[PDB]
Design a protein around this nucleic acid. Structure first.
Ligand SMILES: [Ca+2]
Length: 579
DNA sequence: GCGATCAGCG
DNA sequence: ACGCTGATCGCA
């Protein structure tokens, strides 16, 4: 039902200077994944190519790599990384429909062309699920069915760039798409393809040591509980704790007894099995997720893991990291922080460099709320987390333990993002009246932040959405809900999303300026990871000096706020030593 | 498949 | 009854 050429060879009319392009990687994880078909829609017609044909043709490769030949795509990063695994560069992507859809409404969860087309009442294209099937029935269909479905996706991309750019313009998001998200998409492709090298010997050794520490812990648990049970099964774990040992019930999930770590820490005075269980889970978490899980996804030839950065998933504009998640590698506990010793540079004589913004969401909040005292605090380069530990625990700066600090870190974010006195009290083991009066005092020092939280909720109510400093947008329909719980979660979304998503935009612009900087300095240094407010690079040791002077300035200068941005930086032989 | 849990980022 | 994630595991 759609006219197109099944091309046997590459012709000149498939090489126009503007085109919609589809490079299908059906595999979920597109690293080293097969390319199953290629479709080109342009002013001369609709063409389907087999990858063996086109990806071996010198003119087609030349056309993919030519930045002056513009391509419109859905999920250009997926295509670009699959082609990198094939020795082929893709440039000139001028429109990425996936990222256009994402800016317009991140809650749609657009994950194929058909879902984004629907936003503009375009339906001449099928959902990928309907073509490839789900689960274990997943299959590339036959060439005639595959070819039409790629051509329909391409035709759809072709027809929708203009209506999508039009809405982006009205929303003030067009420069956000073309100058921020699409450039960032090429950078993330380089980072994902480059990978991070992993010391598998060291990781293997930790795994053998974790196995023997686990049993030993697991044994004391069995002799304290009397019997044995699936310590991971809250069924009999509940029966052990809140029935056999008769410990108080402090929380009930919808399932039953809550055995979460906040509860267990509160039961620590009652019995010496709750601490062992906690130590057991920690050791379990390290062994399943970061020892075993990491070794599974290591590419054996190179000992590099290749994350996938989701750019169009989170509701606030942050990235997300998947298979493996390299954005929640342990750091706070010593046993788990040792895992970062396994993450090493990909080349002898190279080092890891890591820079990060100091309390960036609070600096943003100070800029957006225009709160005098909060702006002054950061113009003094105060550490508000330590200064809050001092007020909480009534000590001096020298006496602030890192524990008291991370606790005040949660009070600072918790208070500004709507924590209740109940919630503040559960986290400080103080009375609920003390927690309420601390929150009153805290908004005495920062009335401008209080005004800001009231106003942003009135602005959500009026407009239907909240925006970020760079005009990322998030619809909050529940902000006017009649249900008190549903309305309150939406109010705290209105207080949080403009801040957290403004910090995501800032580090996104920083990454873009960093790459351009590294290119004019022509350094071999390159990004490896982004962990929300931290940029981790690797580089030859000969380049660290330059990087110490370039990376902080580039980050601090990404945007200009009414308070300065602060950046800490370290380097070392491993990611461990880079903090 | 989903809820609980927990690792990280703020 | 602060917010944003992803992986693992058990299953009331
Ligand atoms: Ca930080």
């Amino acid at each position: 039902k759609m006219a197109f050429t099944l091309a046997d060879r590459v012709t000149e009319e498939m090489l126009a200077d503007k085109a919609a392009l589809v490079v299908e990687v059906v595999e979920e994880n597109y690293h080293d994944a097969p390319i199953v078909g290629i479709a080109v829609v342009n002013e001369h017609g609709r063409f389907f190519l087999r990858p063996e044909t086109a990806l071996a043709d010198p003119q087609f490769v030349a056309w993919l790599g030519d930045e002056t030949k513009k391509k419109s795509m859905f999920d250009s990063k997926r295509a670009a990384v699959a082609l990198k695994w094939k020795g082929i560069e893709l440039c000139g992507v001028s429109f990425d429909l996936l990222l256009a859809a994402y800016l317009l409404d991140p809650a749609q969860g657009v994950d194929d062309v058909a879902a984004a087309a629907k936003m503009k009442q375009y339906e001449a294209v099928r959902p990928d699920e309907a073509v490839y099937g789900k689960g274990a029935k997943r299959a590339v269909p036959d060439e005639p069915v595959l070819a039409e479905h790629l051509v329909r996706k391409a035709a759809a991309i072709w027809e929708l760039e203009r209506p999508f750019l039009d809405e982006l313009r009205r929303n003030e998001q067009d420069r956000l798409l073309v100058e921020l998200e699409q450039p960032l998409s090429s950078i993330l492709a380089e980072m994902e393809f480059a990978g991070v090298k992993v010391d598998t010997k060291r990781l293997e050794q930790m795994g053998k040591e974790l196995a023997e520490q686990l049993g030993t812990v697991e044994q004391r648990i069995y002799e304290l509980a009397g019997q044995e049970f699936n310590i991971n099964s809250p069924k009999q774990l509940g029966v052990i704790l809140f029935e056999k040992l008769q410990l108080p019930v402090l929380k009930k999930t919808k399932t039953g007894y809550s055995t979460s770590a906040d509860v267990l820490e509160k039961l620590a005075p009652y019995h010496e099995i709750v601490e062992n269980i906690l130590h057991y889970r920690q050791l379990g978490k390290l062994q399943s997720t970061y020892i075993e899980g990491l070794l599974k996804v290591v590419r054996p030839a190179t000992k590099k893991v290749h994350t996938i950065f989701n750019q169009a998933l989170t509701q606030t504009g942050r990235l997300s990291s998947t298979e493996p998640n390299l954005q929640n590698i342990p750091i706070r506990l010593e046993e788990g922080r040792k895992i970062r010793q396994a993450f090493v540079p990909s080349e002898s004589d190279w080092l890891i460099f890591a820079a990060d913004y100091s309390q960036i969401e609070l600096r943003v909040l100070a800029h957006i709320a225009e709160d005098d005292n909060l702006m002054e605090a950061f113009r003094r380069d105060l550490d508000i987390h330590t200064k809050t530990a001092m007020d909480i625990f009534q000590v001096s700066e020298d006496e602030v333990t890192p524990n008291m600090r991370r606790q005040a870190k949660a009070v600072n974010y918790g208070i500004v993002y709507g924590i209740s006195d109940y919630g503040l009290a559960q986290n400080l083991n103080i009375s609920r009246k003390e927690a309420a009066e601390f929150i009153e005092r805290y908004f005495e020092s920062f009335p401008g932040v209080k005004r800001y939280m009231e106003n942003i909720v009135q602005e959500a109510k009026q407009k239907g959405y909240v925006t970020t400093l760079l005009h990322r947008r998030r619809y909050l329909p529940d902000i006017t809900s009649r249900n008190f719980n549903v309305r309150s979660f939406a109010e705290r979304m209105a207080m949080n999303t403009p801040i957290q998503g403004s910090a995501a935009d800032i580090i996104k612009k920083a990454m873009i300026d960093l790459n351009a900087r590294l290119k004019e300095e022509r350094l071999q240094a390159h990004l490896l990871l982004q962990v929300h407010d931290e940029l981790i690079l690797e580089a030859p040791k000969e380049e660290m000096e330059r990087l110490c002077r370039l990376v902080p300035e580039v980050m601090e200068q990404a945007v200009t706020l009414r308070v300065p941005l602060k950046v800490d930086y370290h380097y070392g032989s491993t990611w461990y030593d880079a903090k």
